[PDB]
Curated annotation (Swiss-Prot), chain B:
Changing residue 19 to A: Impairs bactericidal activity against E.coli and S.aureus. Changing residue 28 to A: Slight decrease in antibacterial activity against E.coli and S.aureus. GO terms for biological process: antibacterial humoral response; antifungal humoral response; antimicrobial humoral immune response mediated by antimicrobial peptide; antimicrobial humoral response; cellular response to lipopolysaccharide; defense response to fungus; defense response to Gram-negative bacterium; defense response to Gram-positive bacterium. The lineage of its organism: Eukaryota, Metazoa, Chordata, Craniata, Vertebrata. It comes from Homo sapiens. This is Defensin alpha 4. Changing residue 30 to A: Impairs bactericidal activity against E.coli and S.aureus. Changing residue 29 to A: Impairs bactericidal activity against E.coli and S.aureus.
């Protein structure tokens, strides 16, 4: 499952891309 | 729950932004209420 986080992904996740919400790039993380 | 979809969200969902994955800009969608 994936989560849009603020900065870091969890130790259980890898960064797959960005989640862009109102001109700000959050970090898209998947297990 | 939120999802990355191609092109359109579902009717019952809120379009909240985009998932940028590799070359593709997907639509970031979340379930309403």
């Amino acid at each position: 499952v994936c989560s849009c986080r603020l900065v870091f992904c969890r130790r259980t996740e890898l960064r797959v891309g960005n989640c862009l919400i109102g001109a700000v790039s959050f970090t898209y993380c998947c297990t």
